[PDB]
Scaffold this active site. Sequence first.
Site, PDB file in Angstrom:
ATOM      1  N   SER A 384      32.204  45.268  42.963  1.00 38.00           N
ATOM      2  CA  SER A 384      31.376  46.260  42.301  1.00 38.00           C
ATOM      3  C   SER A 384      31.915  47.697  42.440  1.00 38.00           C
ATOM      4  O   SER A 384      33.055  47.915  42.871  1.00 38.00           O
ATOM      5  CB  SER A 384      29.949  46.176  42.833  1.00 38.00           C
ATOM      6  N   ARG A 386      31.516  50.340  44.518  1.00 37.26           N
ATOM      7  CA  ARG A 386      32.099  50.877  45.736  1.00 37.26           C
ATOM      8  C   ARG A 386      33.541  50.373  45.896  1.00 37.26           C
ATOM      9  O   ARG A 386      34.402  51.091  46.414  1.00 37.26           O
ATOM     10  CB  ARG A 386      31.263  50.491  46.957  1.00 37.26           C
ATOM     11  N   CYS A 387      33.805  49.147  45.445  1.00 39.58           N
ATOM     12  CA  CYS A 387      35.147  48.571  45.551  1.00 39.58           C
ATOM     13  C   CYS A 387      36.110  49.225  44.561  1.00 39.58           C
ATOM     14  O   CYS A 387      37.311  49.308  44.812  1.00 39.58           O
ATOM     15  CB  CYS A 387      35.111  47.051  45.282  1.00 39.58           C
ATOM     16  N   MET A 388      35.573  49.679  43.436  1.00 40.99           N
ATOM     17  CA  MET A 388      36.382  50.305  42.395  1.00 40.99           C
ATOM     18  C   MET A 388      36.516  51.817  42.547  1.00 40.99           C
ATOM     19  O   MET A 388      36.830  52.530  41.590  1.00 40.99           O
ATOM     20  CB  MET A 388      35.790  49.983  41.024  1.00 40.99           C
TER      21      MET A 388
END
Lengths: 399, 399
Positions: A384, A386-388
Site C-alpha cells: 500500500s 506507506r510502502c510506495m
Amino acid sequence: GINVYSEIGELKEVLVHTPGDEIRYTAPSRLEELLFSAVLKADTAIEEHKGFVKILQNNGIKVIQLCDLVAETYELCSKEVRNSFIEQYLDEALPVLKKEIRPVVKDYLLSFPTVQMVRKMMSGILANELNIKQDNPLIIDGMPNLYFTRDPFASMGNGVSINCMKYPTRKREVIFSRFVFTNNPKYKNTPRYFDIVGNNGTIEGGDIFIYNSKTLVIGNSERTNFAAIESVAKNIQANKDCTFERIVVINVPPMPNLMHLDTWLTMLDYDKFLYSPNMMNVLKIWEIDLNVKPVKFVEKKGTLEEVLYSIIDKKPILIPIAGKGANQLDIDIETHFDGTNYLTIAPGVVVGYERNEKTQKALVEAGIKVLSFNGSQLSLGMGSARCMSMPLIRENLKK
Amino acid sequence: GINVYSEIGELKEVLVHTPGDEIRYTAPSRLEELLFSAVLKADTAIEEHKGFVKILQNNGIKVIQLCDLVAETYELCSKEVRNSFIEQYLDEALPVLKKEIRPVVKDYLLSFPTVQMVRKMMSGILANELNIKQDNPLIIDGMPNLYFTRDPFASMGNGVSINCMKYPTRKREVIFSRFVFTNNPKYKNTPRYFDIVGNNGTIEGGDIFIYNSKTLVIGNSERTNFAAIESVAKNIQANKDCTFERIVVINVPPMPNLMHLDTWLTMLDYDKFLYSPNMMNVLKIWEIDLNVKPVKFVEKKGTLEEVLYSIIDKKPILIPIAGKGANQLDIDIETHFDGTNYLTIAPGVVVGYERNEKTQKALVEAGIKVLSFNGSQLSLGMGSARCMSMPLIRENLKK
Ligand SMILES: [Cl-]
Ligand SMILES: [Cl-]
C-alpha cells in the site's frame, strides 16, 4: 535534506517512483524469481500511481521522482564518477552480462538523454532493443519493486538507513538512492546510521518506524536482527545533532499473512494506531537507552496497549484491520491487500487503497480523515501507500 | 431452443452470468479450494462484465442471464418440482449443512422474490446473514466460477452436453442449467448427447467445438476421455434431426497449464484460426464416422494445417498468440490471460480483452474485426470471452 522525526508530522517532501517498463517485463513463471506478486496491466497501474502522486501534490507535498533525483545527481557529477555509476550498474546486472554484450549495453544507455537513460537502467533491457536474437527475451531484468521506495533506504531522524535487502534481485535497487546520498550536495552529508558496507546484520524498511523526536521503533523480525539494530544504535550515539534517545525493539516472529513490523502495526495520529487482529497477544520488547554506553538490550513484555502507552504516555486508540466485529473473510482479504500500510501525511490524515472498505470505515469512525485512491491494479503488488513512499522531510511535532 | 452448428455463425441468443456476491466470498487462502485464480475487486469486475454484455447486445444478440432463465423456469414449475429444486441445492451445499441450520437456510431462501432467491443460491450465504455465530464466515460457499457459462453445459448442434465437472466445488454449478433443460418448455425437449447420469466417462466445455453442420471437434484431454466421446457419438446416432456426420478427436497432452483444447486452438472465421505457439507440432487425431456402427476411433496423424484442411477443405490461415515474431515474454503474458479464447459473434468478428494487444494486432492484420473491452479485473479469473459465454442459437452457415 533529511528530517523525519515522526510517522505523522505534516509531510513536506517525499520520494516515490512511478513504475516504468519494468512492470511490463515480469513473466508469469518468474513471479517468485523476481520476487513480485502478479502480472499487472501496466498502463492501468501506472495511471493509478499517478493518481496517488496527484493526491499528495494537492496536499502541498513536494513529490520527488527517483529517476529525476538520480538524473539531477548525475548531471552534477564528474565524468569519472558518472562512468563509475554506469560501470557499477553493469557489474550488478542480472542475468550476468557476457563480455561482448556489455559494451553494447553501455553504448545503448549512453545514447539516451540522462533521465531516459536512468529509466532504462530501472526498466531493464529487452533483447529486441539491442537487435540481439535469443529465446530469453531479456538482456537485463527490470526491477519491478522500484515503486516500493520504502525499501532501499529509510529516513531516520536527521540520517538514513540504507537497507540490506535479502535477495540479489532487490539488492540491485539500492544503487540509485545510494548514488544520490553519495554525490548529491543536498544529501551527501546525511549521516548513515546503517549502510550496506561498514556495519553488521540485516535490516529492512518495513521494520523501521519513527514515533517521535526521542523514540525510534524497530521490529526484530526475520529480516532485521539485533546486529543491525546495534550498529544503528552506535552510529546514532556518535552523531551530535540527532535527538533520538531511545530505541524500542519489537519482536516480530513469522505469522500467517504477515511479515515486517508494518504489517502488524502502523501509527496514524498522536494516539491512533492500526493493527492486525491476528498478531500475538503479549509482545516481547527490548528497551535500548541511547544515553548509556555500552548499548544494552533490556528485555521487557506487555500487551500492545502497555507497550504503546510506555511510548506516547497516553491511552492508545487501537483500530483492527477491517474494524471491530469483522468476520475472518474480510480480515483475510484486507490483510491480503496490505490494510495497515496507509501513508500518514498529517496527524489524523491518511492515504490508501479504496478497496479496503471495512478498514477505511473503521478509520473514519475513529476520527481519521481518509484520502483514498483507486489502485485496482497497483494493489495486486501487495503493497500500500506507506510502502510506495519514503518521507524525506516532515514538520517536527510539537505534540 | 438450441441450434448451434458452428463456432462463427451470426450469434442470436447467448447465455451469460454477470457475477453476484459470490466473487466477494473467496478468501485469499482458498483460491485453490474454490478453484478460482485471484481475489477480485468485485464492483469493478461486475461493471466490466456488464460492458461485455453491452457489446453483445449492441450487436443485436439476445443476451440471457442464467439467474433470469432459472427464475423463469421456477415460476412455471409445480410446487413439488420447485421444492425439489431447493432440496437438491441444500443437499449439494458446501460446507455440508448442519441439521438445525438447514431449515434456517431454507426459510431464508424462500423469503426472497424468485430472482433474488436464485441469486442467493448462486452467491452463497454468510453466517452474518442468518445471525449465526461460528468459525466459518460462510454457511454456504458461493460459486465464483458461475460467470464462466462455457462449463456447465455446451450447446452441440440441436442438442446439449451437460458436462461432468472435475471437482465438487464446480459440480454444484450444474444444478441451475440442468433445472432449465429439465423443466423449461422451451428447452425441455432438447436432446442430451451427454449428461451426468446415463453415460460413461468425463467431458468439459473447454474441449467442445462445432466446426460446421457435419463436423464436431472434441479434444481428448485430461478432462475429456474416449468413454465420454463414445457416449456422445452413440447418443447422436440415435437422434434423427441432428446433422452431425463426423467427429474429429484431437489429442491434448496434459501439460502443466493445459486442461482443454480451447487454450490450444479456436476458430474465428471460415478459414481463420488462433493457436498457441507452444502446442505440439504433429497432432494425433481420431476420426469417427457417425454413419458407421459400432463407433470406431480411427487414429491418424498430421500437422495443424493438414488436420484443419481435412475439415474445412481449404487452406487454413493460422494466427499464433501474440503474433508472428513475438518474443517469449509477450507470448507468455497473453497466453496467461487466455489469449485464444475470443468469442466469435459473426464470421470474422470477435470479442475479447483489450489487454492482449499483440494478439489483437495480429487478428486485425489478418482481416478479423475485434471488439475489445476492458476486463482489467475479470481477466484475473483466467478466462476470456468464449469462457464467459454459451451460444444457444447461431445462424446456420451457408459456407
Ligand atoms: Cl483499490
Ligand atoms: Cl483487459
